[PDB]
């Protein structure tokens, strides 16, 4: 059937947004691998483990409120299969922060280019919410890791605990 | 002409005044639905308040309009608040699906302001309807969608449960 | 690789572990998709949709719980595909509470076969672990969902919408 | 003969007497460890304090399990608290590891214990083991590894920083 609320919301822009949600649910499964890793006996760098784990639920936030937004213009949602994190283990704090910034860029660029496929149809609604809930967020978060990762190179063992201590639990 | 005009255009400040107009209109419209749901003969408070504060929600939306308009550099030009459509607006069913159609048109004005606005290349007047106007607008279509779906799904008894455990509180 | 914290903790009940944690994020995924769809405009209630919602999160901190155990006991967590909930629309809260109440009883099915497991590898703070955590839960929730699914049969339009404003809360 | 012994077996009772003595000869090594890490030469005050609680805990757990014995109608029977295996515990690292150990051997006694009751059928001493001394000695290793991975990572001033951002805080 027809939604009777569905105004100015196009089938692309429904399925943009549930491929947007999967990758939300994918991001926030990642960093919920991340921070269990980090939280092992071997590991032991439990502020890194709570930066991943509250990544994580923002992530799992950011999911929900799409599927809140797609409820409320009138489109079906659609689940798809939550794909498993790229890698079991993740090596040092170092390559782990690289691989949550490459993965926070993808997120990125899926959320510009769903903002350039709704002001293409026209969608002002759809764009309003992106910016004012998606963006400024985002990059706020890649300005964050960004500097993290700085930080990390900078004291590139001891420094890395370092880092933990004074950077991540502070 | 005036000093602080800027970026404002003429064809703008004529959507922004047929704007202000249908929202007036939709509150007179609201005002009529409240106080048809009030008689002796509907007895149905609830939904006569729901109106009443919708048609208050659309007088705002009028005023910060003007508010707006004001200070673009754009004069307002009021024109004539039209009547509502009936007297009369039967089950409250039927109401609802008239306050839904109201405010898709009105949703639809307010997308047609903004590309127009955007086609002009007037990003004030678009965030301002975008951060004032559309989710607004969204959120009431949304719960008068549900409001409908519940009016359908109690469908007498069920008119009256519905304004009792729905709509009172 | 031979952690020094592992101490009668064996690779069955860790597997075993690993695959409750995949069950319960299914779980979880499948009531989120059950609470977005109690949330539709054509479907419009919202205290089934909040039910389901508050019990994707217990199932979340249920997952969470048992990978933080996996990690005290020195095990490694293995994150496998979370796979997709089993139906897209759930029709009536009735049908929709059924396969809710199916879907627990099969998570505490799977809690006992762990447990009975666990007894068999004489590993006693497992099994006090979903004692204490996870069985007297699983076995409340599935008496409130016996409960809501015998007062749905009473109520059975009418009856399914005072079921939602007089029962579940908001 | 005791009027209130009941489901209560000669064996696991001699057990929670080991278990008691166990217990208090791990309070005995941890004192000695905290008490050596406040020393002139070590100058390390963050574990010894870690040592001093870990003490306070083990005896703690004795004091439980006397209590349990006598809750059960068994008589205790107190033995010789052995000195400490070793004067000096070098480093913090070669002292953790060393406490590490006592606690696998600690735990892998109450698993006996339990193991022991389990055959036995006495459910009152495995549900009071599982509510008051499994987790708590899990969590204690789980502790130990992390605090040993972090001596590992930050491995003389690695050491001191660990003292003074990990144990102090």
Redesign the interface.
């Known amino acids: 059937?027809t939604?009777?609320?569905r105004?100015?919301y196009s089938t692309e822009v429904e399925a943009a947004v549930n491929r947007l949600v999967n990758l939300h649910?994918r991001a926030s499964?990642t960093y919920?691998?991340l921070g269990?890793?980090f939280?092992?006996?071997?590991?032991?760098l439990?502020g890194v483990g709570h930066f991943f784990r509250e990544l994580a639920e923002e992530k799992r936030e950011g999911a929900?409120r799409l599927?809140?937004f797609q409820?409320?213009?009138?489109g079906?949602?659609?689940?798809?299969?939550?794909?498993?994190?790229s890698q079991?283990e993740w090596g040092k704090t170092q390559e782990a922060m690289e691989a949550a910034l490459a993965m926070e860029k993808n997120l990125n660029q899926a959320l510009l280019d769903l903002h350039a496929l709704g002001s293409a149809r026209?969608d002002?609604?759809l764009?309003?919410?992106l910016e004012?809930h998606y963006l400024d967020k985002e990059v706020k978060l890649i300005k964050k890791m960004g500097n993290h990762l700085t930080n990390l190179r900078r004291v590139a063992?001891?420094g890395?605990?370092?880092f933990e201590?004074?950077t991540l639990?502070h």
């Open positions: 059937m939604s009777q609320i105004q100015n649910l499964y919920l691998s269990f890793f939280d092992r006996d071997d590991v032991a439990e929900e599927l809140e409820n409320d213009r009138g079906r949602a659609l689940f798809q299969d939550v794909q498993k994190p079991d026209a002002p609604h764009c309003d919410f004012s063992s001891l890395e605990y370092l201590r004074l639990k």
